[PDB]
Amino acid sequence: MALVLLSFGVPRKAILYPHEEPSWSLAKDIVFHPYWMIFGEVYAYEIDVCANDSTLPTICGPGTWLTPFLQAVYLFVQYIIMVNLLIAFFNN
Amino acid sequence: MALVLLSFGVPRKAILYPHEEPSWSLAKDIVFHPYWMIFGEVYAYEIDVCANDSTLPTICGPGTWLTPFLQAVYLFVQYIIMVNLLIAFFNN
Numbered sequence A, B: 001m002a003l004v005l006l007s008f009g010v011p012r013k014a015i016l017y018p019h020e021e022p023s024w025s026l027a028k029d030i031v032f033h034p035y036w037m038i039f040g041e042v043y044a045y046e047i048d049v050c051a052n053d054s055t056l057p058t059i060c061g062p063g064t065w066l067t068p069f070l071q072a073v074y075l076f077v078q079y080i081i082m083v084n085l086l087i088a089f090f091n092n
Ligand SMILES: CCCCCCCC/C=C/CCCCCCCC(=O)O[C@@H](COC(=O)CCCCCCCCCCCCCCC)COP(=O)([O-])OCC[N+](C)(C)C
Pocket: A001, A002, A005, A038
């Protein structure tokens, strides 16, 4: 579940923030939001940053349309596969 | 699950609110938010109170960077261990 977390956070930060200097904040940002998605937080108005109801309208830029597809795959793997695999692990 | 709740609420209130007089509101605040986290509410914009998108920007202060780590551990224990232990209890 932690490798799936990093498989999503690194491209999302890379696509949405293309103009970053090296900083230890990059370690925070690739882990932070994808972790809280395991626990119910979809960040509904930060998906599709180029939409009209977005709370991150300045992050809209070249290629940020990829991130809704990335997050759809992420949560399918996390809730629908890995959380239910973990329920099933405990039962048996 | 109730002791894990108090193991998290007391330090979060202590770290984020260091200048409190004795009041019965302290009994409320160490229980209130950690309980609603069991039920889907991550309080996404109150995590990392020193961030730019925070809804509690005046709570930023010395040592408030500890609370995202505390809440990550809390919800791992609550959903991923204790809720699934309770699903498994009912099944068997
Ligand atoms: C629930 C616990 C996880 C939570 C963290 C707390 C851990 C608490 C304690 C846990 C007890 C440890 C259990 C046994 C393992 C022993 C040490 C070890 O690492 O060994 C393995 C090497 O490790 C690897 O091959 C992978 C190393 C990556 C670890 C990164 C942690 C990511 C999860 C972090 C969470 C991210 C959350 C994001 C997703 C929600 C190999 O195993 P071994 O050494 O051969 O020993 C195995 C058994 N034996 C002795 C019979 C051989």
